[PDB]
């Protein structure tokens, strides 16, 4: 599990509502959150499958 998989999800300052995936470390699974549209951190995946693969 890369260490970036431990970051909390990061919405960023933009105000879109883009459904993205993030690894929730405690819960041990890929979960949905709201991504604002700019300034993505790496714990931010475009599908569950990508998220599950990396993290």
């Amino acid at each position: 599990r890369p260490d970036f998989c431990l970051e909390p999800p990061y919405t960023g300052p933009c105000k879109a509502r883009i459904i993205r995936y993030f690894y929730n470390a405690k819960a041990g699974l890929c979960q949905t959150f709201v991504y604002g549209g700019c300034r993505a951190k790496r714990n931010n995946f475009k599908s569950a499958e990508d998220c599950m693969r990396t993290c």
């Binding site: 919405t11 300052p13 933009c14 105000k15 879109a16 509502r17 883009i18 459904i19 709201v34 604002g36 549209g37 700019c38």
Partner: protein, 224 residues
């Protein structure tokens, strides 16, 4: 829209929802075939939903029209959000009726103190997530450039302005980008960005539509 109220059914007939399988941004109908939205709302395929009020329910007034062209400002900057504007040409004309109509382009820049209406289906909570079905409205004033700059030092270009309240509690939020800021019947802004939603000393930053008038005229012309 944090700290807003349900807009009356179809009282913002120019408001659109952009949809990629779900509502992701707003926009403004500025003519029968063109919608203005923000640059960071870009995607290669977008369905434009007009005459919506409740985005969960087919009421019977909605027109669902595919985006035939999607033209982000060519100097949109993803890092600074400068030139955060985008045009969408609809694949067919919108049928103008009482629930769908256009909003005029601004004829002068925003004027400080002017009371504007901001609308959207974005988060209504300043922390956590409370995304509404019903279109949300919010009355808010244009802030001076000094306040805007004090709030976001070094981050505001002459293409941005601030609308809201330094005391916090009322603001646009995630899911509102691309939607309108309307003052005395003119489209003065596009919901663009901010540090959180509705936080003290952090009003929303909005793209200054007046600055893009020519670009909009020309892009329309070149794609007519």
């Amino acid at each position: 829209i944090v700290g807003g109220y349900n807009c009356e059914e179809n009282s913002v007939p120019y408001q659109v929802s952009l949809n990629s399988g779900y509502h992701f941004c707003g926009g403004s109908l500025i003519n029968e075939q063109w919608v203005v939205s923000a640059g960071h709302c870009y995607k290669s395929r977008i369905q434009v939903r007009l005459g919506e009020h409740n985005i969960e329910v087919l009421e019977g007034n909605e027109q669902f029209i595919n985006a035939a062209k999607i033209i982000r400002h060519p100097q949109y900057d993803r890092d600074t959000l400068n030139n955060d504007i985008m045009l969408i040409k609809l694949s067919s004309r919108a049928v103008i009726n009482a629930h769908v109509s256009t909003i005029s382009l601004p004829t002068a820049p925003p004027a400080t103190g002017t009371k504007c209406l901001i609308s959207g289906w974005g988060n209504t909570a300043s922390s956590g997530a409370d995304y509404p079905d019903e279109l949300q409205c919010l009355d808010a004033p244009v802030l001076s450039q000094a306040k805007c700059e004090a709030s976001y030092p070094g981050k505001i270009t002459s293409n941005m302005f601030c609308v809201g309240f330094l005391e916090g509690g009322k603001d646009s939020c995630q899911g509102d980008a691309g939607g309108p800021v309307v003052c005395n019947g003119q489209l003065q802004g596009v919901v663009s960005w901010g540090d959180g939603c509705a936080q003290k000393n952090k009003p929303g930053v909005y793209t200054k539509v007046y600055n893009y008038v020519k670009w909009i005229k020309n892009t329309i012309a070149a794609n007519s």
